Amino acid sequence: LFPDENKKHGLPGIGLSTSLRPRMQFSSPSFVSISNECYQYSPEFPLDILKSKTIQMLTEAVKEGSLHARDPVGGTTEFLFVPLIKLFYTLLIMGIFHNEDLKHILQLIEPSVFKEAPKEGLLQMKLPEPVKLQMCLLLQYLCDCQVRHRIEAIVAFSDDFVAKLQDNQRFRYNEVMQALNMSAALTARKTKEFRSPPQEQINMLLNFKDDKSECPCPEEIRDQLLDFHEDLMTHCGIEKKSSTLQQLISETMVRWAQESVIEDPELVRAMFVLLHRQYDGIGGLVRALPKTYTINGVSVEDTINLLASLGQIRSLLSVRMGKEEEKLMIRGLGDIMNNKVFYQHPNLMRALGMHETVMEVMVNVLGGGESKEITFPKMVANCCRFLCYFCRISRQNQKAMFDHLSYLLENSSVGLASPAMRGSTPLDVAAASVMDNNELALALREPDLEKVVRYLAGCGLQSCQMLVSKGYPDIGWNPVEGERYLDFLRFAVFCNGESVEENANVVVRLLIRRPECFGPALRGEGGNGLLAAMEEAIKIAEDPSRDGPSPEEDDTIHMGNAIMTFYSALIDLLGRCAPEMHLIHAGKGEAIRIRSILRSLIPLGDLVGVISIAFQMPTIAKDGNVVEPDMSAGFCPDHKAAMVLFLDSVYGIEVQDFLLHLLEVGFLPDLRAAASLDTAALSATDMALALNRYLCTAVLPLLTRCAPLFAGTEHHASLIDSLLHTVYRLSKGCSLTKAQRDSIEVCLLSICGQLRPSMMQHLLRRLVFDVPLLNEHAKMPLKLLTNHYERCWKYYCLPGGWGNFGAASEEELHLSRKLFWGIFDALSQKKYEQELFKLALPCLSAVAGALPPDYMESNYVSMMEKQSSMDSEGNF
Amino acid sequence: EIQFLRTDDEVVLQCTATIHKEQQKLCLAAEGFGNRLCFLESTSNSKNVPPDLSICTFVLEQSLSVRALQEMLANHRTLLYGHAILLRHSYSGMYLCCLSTSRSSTDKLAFDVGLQEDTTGEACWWTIHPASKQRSEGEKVRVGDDLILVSVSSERYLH
Amino acid sequence: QRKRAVVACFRMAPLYNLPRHRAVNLFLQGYEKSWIETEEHYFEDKLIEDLAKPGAEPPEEDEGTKRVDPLHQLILLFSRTALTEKCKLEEDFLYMAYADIMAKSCHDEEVKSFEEKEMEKQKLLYQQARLHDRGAAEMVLQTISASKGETGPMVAATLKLGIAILNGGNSTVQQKMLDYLKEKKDVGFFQSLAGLMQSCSVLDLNAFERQNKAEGLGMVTEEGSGEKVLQDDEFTCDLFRFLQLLCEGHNSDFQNYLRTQTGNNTTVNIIISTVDYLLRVQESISDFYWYYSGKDVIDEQGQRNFSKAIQVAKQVFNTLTEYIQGPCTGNQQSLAHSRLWDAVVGFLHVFAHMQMKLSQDSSQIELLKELMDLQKDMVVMLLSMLEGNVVNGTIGKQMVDMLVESSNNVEMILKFFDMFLKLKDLTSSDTFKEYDPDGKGVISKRDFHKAMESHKHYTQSETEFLLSCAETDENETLDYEEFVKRFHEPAKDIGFNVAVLLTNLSEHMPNDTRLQTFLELAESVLNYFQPFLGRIEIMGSAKRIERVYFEISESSRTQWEKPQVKESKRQFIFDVVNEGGEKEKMELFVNFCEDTIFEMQLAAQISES
Amino acid sequence: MADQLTEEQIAEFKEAFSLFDKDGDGTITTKELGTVMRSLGQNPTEAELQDMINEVNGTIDFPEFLTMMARKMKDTDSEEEIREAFRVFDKDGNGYISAAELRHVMTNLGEKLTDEEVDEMIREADIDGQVNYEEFVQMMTA
Amino acid sequence: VESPEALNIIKEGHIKSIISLLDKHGRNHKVLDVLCSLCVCHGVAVRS
Numbered sequence A: 001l002f003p004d005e006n007k008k009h010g011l012p013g014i015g016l017s018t019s020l021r022p023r024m025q026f027s028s029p030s031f032v033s034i035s036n037e038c039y040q041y042s043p044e045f046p047l048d049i050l051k052s053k054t055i056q057m058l059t060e061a062v063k064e065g066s067l068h069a070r071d072p073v074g075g076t077t078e079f080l081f082v083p084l085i086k087l088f089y090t091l092l093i094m095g096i097f098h099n100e101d102l103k104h105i106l107q108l109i110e111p112s113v114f115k116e117a118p119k120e121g122l123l124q125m126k127l128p129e130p131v132k133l134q135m136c137l138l139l140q141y142l143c144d145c146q147v148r149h150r151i152e153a154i155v156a157f158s159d160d161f162v163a164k165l166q167d168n169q170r171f172r173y174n175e176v177m178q179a180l181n182m183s184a185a186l187t188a189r190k191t192k193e194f195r196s197p198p199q200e201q202i203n204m205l206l207n208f209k210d211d212k213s214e215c216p217c218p219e220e221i222r223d224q225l226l227d228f229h230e231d232l233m234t235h236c237g238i239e240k241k242s243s244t245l246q247q248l249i250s251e252t253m254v255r256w257a258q259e260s261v262i263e264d265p266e267l268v269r270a271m272f273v274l275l276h277r278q279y280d281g282i283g284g285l286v287r288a289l290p291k292t293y294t295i296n297g298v299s300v301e302d303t304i305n306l307l308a309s310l311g312q313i314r315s316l317l318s319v320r321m322g323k324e325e326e327k328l329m330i331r332g333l334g335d336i337m338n339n340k341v342f343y344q345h346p347n348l349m350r351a352l353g354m355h356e357t358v359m360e361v362m363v364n365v366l367g368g369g370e371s372k373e374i375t376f377p378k379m380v381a382n383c384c385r386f387l388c389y390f391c392r393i394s395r396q397n398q399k400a401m402f403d404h405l406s407y408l409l410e411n412s413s414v415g416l417a418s419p420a421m422r423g424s425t426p427l428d429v430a431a432a433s434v435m436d437n438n439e440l441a442l443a444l445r446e447p448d449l450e451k452v453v454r455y456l457a458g459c460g461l462q463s464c465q466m467l468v469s470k471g472y473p474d475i476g477w478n479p480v481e482g483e484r485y486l487d488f489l490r491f492a493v494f495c496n497g498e499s500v501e502e503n504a505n506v507v508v509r510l511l512i513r514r515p516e517c518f519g520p521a522l523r524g525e526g527g528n529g530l531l532a533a534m535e536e537a538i539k540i541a542e543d544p545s546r547d548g549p550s551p552e553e554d555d556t557i558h559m560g561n562a563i564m565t566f567y568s569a570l571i572d573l574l575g576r577c578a579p580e581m582h583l584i585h586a587g588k589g590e591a592i593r594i595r596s597i598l599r600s601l602i603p604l605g606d607l608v609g610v611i612s613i614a615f616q617m618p619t620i621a622k623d624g625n626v627v628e629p630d631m632s633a634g635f636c637p638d639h640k641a642a643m644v645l646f647l648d649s650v651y652g653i654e655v656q657d658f659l660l661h662l663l664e665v666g667f668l669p670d671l672r673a674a675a676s677l678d679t680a681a682l683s684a685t686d687m688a689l690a691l692n693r694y695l696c697t698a699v700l701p702l703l704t705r706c707a708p709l710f711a712g713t714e715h716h717a718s719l720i721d722s723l724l725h726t727v728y729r730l731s732k733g734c735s736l737t738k739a740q741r742d743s744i745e746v747c748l749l750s751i752c753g754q755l756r757p758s759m760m761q762h763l764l765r766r767l768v769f770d771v772p773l774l775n776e777h778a779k780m781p782l783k784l785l786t787n788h789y790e791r792c793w794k795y796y797c798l799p800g801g802w803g804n805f806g807a808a809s810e811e812e813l814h815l816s817r818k819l820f821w822g823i824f825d826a827l828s829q830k831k832y833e834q835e836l837f838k839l840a841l842p843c844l845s846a847v848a849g850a851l852p853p854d855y856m857e858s859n860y861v862s863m864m865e866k867q868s869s870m871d872s873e874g875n876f
Numbered sequence B: 001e002i003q004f005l006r007t008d009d010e011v012v013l014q015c016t017a018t019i020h021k022e023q024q025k026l027c028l029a030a031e032g033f034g035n036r037l038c039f040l041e042s043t044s045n046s047k048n049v050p051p052d053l054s055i056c057t058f059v060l061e062q063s064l065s066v067r068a069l070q071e072m073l074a075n076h077r078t079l080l081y082g083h084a085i086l087l088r089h090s091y092s093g094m095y096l097c098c099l100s101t102s103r104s105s106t107d108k109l110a111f112d113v114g115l116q117e118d119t120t121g122e123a124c125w126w127t128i129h130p131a132s133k134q135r136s137e138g139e140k141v142r143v144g145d146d147l148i149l150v151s152v153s154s155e156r157y158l159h
Numbered sequence C: 001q002r003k004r005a006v007v008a009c010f011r012m013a014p015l016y017n018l019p020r021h022r023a024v025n026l027f028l029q030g031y032e033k034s035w036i037e038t039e040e041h042y043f044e045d046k047l048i049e050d051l052a053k054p055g056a057e058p059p060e061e062d063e064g065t066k067r068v069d070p071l072h073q074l075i076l077l078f079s080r081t082a083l084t085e086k087c088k089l090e091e092d093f094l095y096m097a098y099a100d101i102m103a104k105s106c107h108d109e110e111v112k113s114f115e116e117k118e119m120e121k122q123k124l125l126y127q128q129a130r131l132h133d134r135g136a137a138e139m140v141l142q143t144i145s146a147s148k149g150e151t152g153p154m155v156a157a158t159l160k161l162g163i164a165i166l167n168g169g170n171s172t173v174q175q176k177m178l179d180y181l182k183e184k185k186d187v188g189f190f191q192s193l194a195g196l197m198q199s200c201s202v203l204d205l206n207a208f209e210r211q212n213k214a215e216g217l218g219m220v221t222e223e224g225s226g227e228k229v230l231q232d233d234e235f236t237c238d239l240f241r242f243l244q245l246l247c248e249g250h251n252s253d254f255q256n257y258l259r260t261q262t263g264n265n266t267t268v269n270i271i272i273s274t275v276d277y278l279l280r281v282q283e284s285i286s287d288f289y290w291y292y293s294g295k296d297v298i299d300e301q302g303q304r305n306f307s308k309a310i311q312v313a314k315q316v317f318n319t320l321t322e323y324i325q326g327p328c329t330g331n332q333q334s335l336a337h338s339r340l341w342d343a344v345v346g347f348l349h350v351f352a353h354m355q356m357k358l359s360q361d362s363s364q365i366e367l368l369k370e371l372m373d374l375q376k377d378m379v380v381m382l383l384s385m386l387e388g389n390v391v392n393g394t395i396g397k398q399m400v401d402m403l404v405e406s407s408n409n410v411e412m413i414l415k416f417f418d419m420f421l422k423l424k425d426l427t428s429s430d431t432f433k434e435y436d437p438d439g440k441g442v443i444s445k446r447d448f449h450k451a452m453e454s455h456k457h458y459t460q461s462e463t464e465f466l467l468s469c470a471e472t473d474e475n476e477t478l479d480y481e482e483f484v485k486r487f488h489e490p491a492k493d494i495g496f497n498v499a500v501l502l503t504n505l506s507e508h509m510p511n512d513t514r515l516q517t518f519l520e521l522a523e524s525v526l527n528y529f530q531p532f533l534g535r536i537e538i539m540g541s542a543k544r545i546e547r548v549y550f551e552i553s554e555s556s557r558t559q560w561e562k563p564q565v566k567e568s569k570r571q572f573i574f575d576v577v578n579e580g581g582e583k584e585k586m587e588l589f590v591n592f593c594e595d596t597i598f599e600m601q602l603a604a605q606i607s608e609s
Numbered sequence D: 001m002a003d004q005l006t007e008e009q010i011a012e013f014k015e016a017f018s019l020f021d022k023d024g025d026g027t028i029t030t031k032e033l034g035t036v037m038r039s040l041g042q043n044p045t046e047a048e049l050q051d052m053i054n055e056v057n058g059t060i061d062f063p064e065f066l067t068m069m070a071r072k073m074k075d076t077d078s079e080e081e082i083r084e085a086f087r088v089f090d091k092d093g094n095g096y097i098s099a100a101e102l103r104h105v106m107t108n109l110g111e112k113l114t115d116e117e118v119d120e121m122i123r124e125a126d127i128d129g130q131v132n133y134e135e136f137v138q139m140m141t142a
Numbered sequence E: 001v002e003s004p005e006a007l008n009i010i011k012e013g014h015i016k017s018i019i020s021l022l023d024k025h026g027r028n029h030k031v032l033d034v035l036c037s038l039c040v041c042h043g044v045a046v047r048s
């Protein structure tokens, strides 16, 4: 803070400054070269010569004006001083002056105050008003230099202080760990510091300014901080000639104001701003510290490059947007993307406030021709993508971006109808501003959702002008934009895997106030229904003419798929808006009302039919290649995922008849198709992966949750044995992720556990062939057999049987004995594996316990056993 | 002095219909005896056909706030915009309510308005809301002012 | 998700694990929040004095005219900026800084005597003159008008400056503001006032519930306290304080101008807008109370929300009281025909229920004190409504109708005050003092219940309610000294205004059985307040005899009863009746009053007990 | 997910992306992603290529690359957490927390509200005390 | 000077017409002032 022990302020600007500053680069102006790269940077100029001439001219002008001669350079004192002082101030801003030059110019400004440690300076020479304004600018720069020096000194002290504080905190942590056993009770209160966010830790560690003995900071560290704070206060002047820049400036401004009635409002404002700055030295630090960031040495070059890109982007705000400037700022945005400091220091990014700069750019681009089609849609998309990534970087960035929600929602209809521009719209920016943030989702207001609902209603009432201009059939609504508005509402109502009750209720109420947001169907007064609408979409997809414009997807929209996606998004939004089971059980009137509304809106039969709608399987053809239906131009399992979600959330499955009916209409065909798609060629197709994802995400977890409904199910044995066979075959099928395999395991285990023992005979027959291989896939069958035999040991061992279930048919006993002997032989002849043996041993023990000890080895084999269907690999 | 609606007062619920480009005044009416459903009785042709106001006259038995209604459901008022009222048929003695069943004439998401004996539940209660911007929530109900009634149970308007 | 926050708390990595630069940045932010911001120094008065001092006003060597001082130039610059026509009032950092400086310079801030009281009054007047002698009032009005009804830091700073220059009811500042407004016919000023008062916010129960959900789901508010509820309580209080200071001192010119602007093309009724905002804030308070009614205890966030709402309502009530004091008959009629009665009914219900609720709990003493201070302010406003009333007056009839509408709540309040006023003669009774032979002051719950049963003035319901309100102890003994100091002391202080209101209504409506019922309900409260309810008759400004009610101190009664004062009174009576002329009998009586006022003070000094 | 990546591994991701450099978008194609994955050390499958590739042309910019990398890798970051969790207290090696220490760690460090510890052990009487750090945390969360 | 919207209407033909006015009518500083207004308007430069 101070050059020596004598706490006297040094000359401003003189000293060691380490803060990052823009690089100074110039290009040689030559008209014989043809490089064309010299058009970056300003042309060169002799800076040393300019500095020396400026100093000499300023000295001469000061000495001449001290005589008050009637021959000023240029004819007037203004003409003599204003240009020269302007050039001098520009050079000082550039930082060309160094050491001796700064001393000389400071002595010229005021010889008495700026002594190094009959002559009058500029400040006391009866200057005109423009000269006074320029001197005010100069003194403002000097104050800025003082503030920057204070910031640098604060950081310099802050390092050693933080290092000592961290060392002492580690020492206290170690002593707490050592005294844990004796102290017991107070260990929690001592570790509360070690279990609070680092901001809170530092807040309490610094919470010792006045009394507040509740501070673990030791006396030496407290004394160091207090001494530095006192020194900083002394430097700021909080606590004989002027001897100080602050006193000199205050006296000069007061003297000017009380000597002349200033006719320049700009001069008055500058003078009083300078006076307030002198009297509010603490306020300078209050403004500067939030915009102060520190980095390590390794990040210096990357930070400099990022600052250069940000400076170019900021400078482009002062030029009218055109093709070249749009290209430049797109390149700068990409450079800021590529710079790794943008991801490492989101706090630095926010302090620089480049989100606000890009926001102003987007505002300018939209406002230019807001009435007509927006110019520079590429620039709008780039700005929106930058804001989305900035939101994704950090939660604090998301909160900062949340403040501009109103403008983004107002301009949410920028590029919704244009494909390939997803994630590059103001609606996408708003969705990122609220996505997966419970604070911001709860902070969402009702007018914002009302605006979104109004936009959705407009989309559902009126067609798309751009689409009908390109040539798409003129239906009476806008599914493409409606789907995006529904997606934003989904993000508003669903957060972190949980439904926001307030937002869900508000959205449902607005949707039922404006029924046109549900599309042409579900409006009533002639609406067909969900199932009829989706069948119509299937027909539209099948018929090319109503699908494309009919004058790489590129400009194609696939209007049938657009309608399907809109209805699926609406169904998913309503399902996520549905109330929860615990609230329904508690009996909340609002929850019951919302559930009744949704049940009346969407009939259960429509959901059942839409789920029962079949897909288009990929087909192998001649030349040994597969033809694959297009994902984007047809029905997709993502559509039925929304139906499953809504059916589970609103109607729910709580009765065996409905469970089994739904299984036999909608789920079993899909499981069978996915199992049939398990061959090597078809397994990598889009249909297969999408169907596997849909199954293991929606259908199998639902069956796992509703497994206990399989308790008394004797008559539908064929159905729920076909289910088991399809599940096992699909599990044996390859190209499945670990999560999908685990979901299959859990579903099959739960269903088999809740099933009756006497009716899993066919699954046992399938498993007795595959288990003895003891390959990687065998772990799930071993667990299944272990659990089954442990639960149903009485079904075999006791001659009477478990009860009304009965006893074995003696071919179940033959199969069990074959399974036991096969597993035993395989484990005997198999090389040791830890987990495989740890899973195989309980299975063998369970089968041995289940088998009656006096069971007769059937020399008379089962009744002309039918293994003709059974095969190697093919199995059928 | 414009009079204010006070609980023990008999009222008729009129509405305007511009059928075939001609204004008609229809009073909400109900029979109660053998016909729970409600209908509309024309009053614009009073000079040629006498209206039957005996089945149109309603009485405001109670006027309680939303919170008071919720408390009462859990376990001489003057009408204020925001209260929940109990409209009792003067002739039948039964109360206006939104019936659970609907005529199902493509309304789908709508119910029917009729009469029922029991005051239990929130079906019989209706909340008053102002018509235009001049009237606000929480001020007194005037005789000449228009209003919109919202069913408490079905959150639906008389339509 | 609270569980998610808990596991993140366990997974957190400490400072010594954190890298050096991250911890340095965090320490910089914490240091700025904790030390630099909290650092405070006082320079505003000295800076304003230096700016106001002219420099070399003899040596200028001009003699053409008196140059305007730097403070005058700054105020002129701000005034010209405000007067420059614009679509929106742009935010000006210089304006916030210097408005704050001048506002802090015009205040210069146990028991204080008369000499230093007028020392402070003279100093405040001089400091306010330093500003309003240079156009500060006109500049404040210009900034408020240019705001055009948009709330913001400009309007906040302008209102603070106006309050600073109007503190104490500055007659000169008021006259200057009125003269400027009448000369300019500024309808924009009143339109901006109406817009700001409409934009003022109230308690937001939905925002409170959302904040509670966020807190309960484990995520901690990294920023300060949730201000989404009662967005700008300080701004609302400052605005209504400025409005009150406009009419402070019964300044009838403003009292009428705020109601109606005679010389302007358009007129805005500030009185009606104020009562509308009072109705809004009362509704918010009632809804928030209904939210907390079911719960047995009120959390700290809820309690501080009650406190802020109570402060806002108290400021609005004080503003209305300043509007109607006078009397200002036009404002009185306007509020009589306004919706003030509904807000008063709601406040009465809230008071009647919240008193019973908060009396039982021992952690809501401050909230109870704030609430009953608000009740006292409301009763003061009602008395100011009754100012200037005649026998069988329309305002009296309306207020009796309001009491009839709030009959249940009024009866509960009266029972509350009777119940906590009988505590003195419960405790001081010898049947109670015998339970505590020593002066320690602790009494058992069983003993205190038995004494309350034996007193025969407390019914069983009152007895059990005071037992519930009694502070529990580990030894099951309560200090009745602290009990009475906590409960009876708010009585005899807030109940006095209720007693005065009831007496005024009874004497001005002699033929109202509806009010007679309340009189029998409040018989005991009036009996307690009889020794302290001073009642005189004066010759009113409306050329009618007006009865005046005020408070007499028991200390004043004792000093009046002291023998020396009695001897002085006897001598004075003989002097005036025998030889004292009837021409200056009132002059002699006032002189005797002043001498006795000094004699009673001297008697209080010399007496010791 | 409040900056779950640290400067170190984001920097190593930085050389991994810049090994092909070439203005960022250039030479960062579908084939390069597997090469950089198995230069870092993890082995994703061909499907584990195609899923990300068609979720995102074929040229991958650094923001999208780092976003997908962070999203996938924001897992298995509780190892050091549980290590420190059992190393802090209960050093007897039984791995079970006493009722007193359970109450002491529930004493909310940021909310400061009490007796909810006793409520949780009342609602989890069977778990009790004999409660282990890991299975406790996945029982206690969802 | 006033309308930035009207400044976008000015094109190469208009600028060359103004320069031809300079060429044909002689040296007029108001033409240079108009050119300065075309170059810079309200602190925003027009590169074209």
Ligand SMILES: O=c1[nH]c(=O)c2nc[nH]c2[nH]1
Pocket: C114, C594, C597
């Ligand atoms: O005007 C006043 N008259 C008095 O009698 C008095 N006593 C104290 N202060 C007083 N002021």
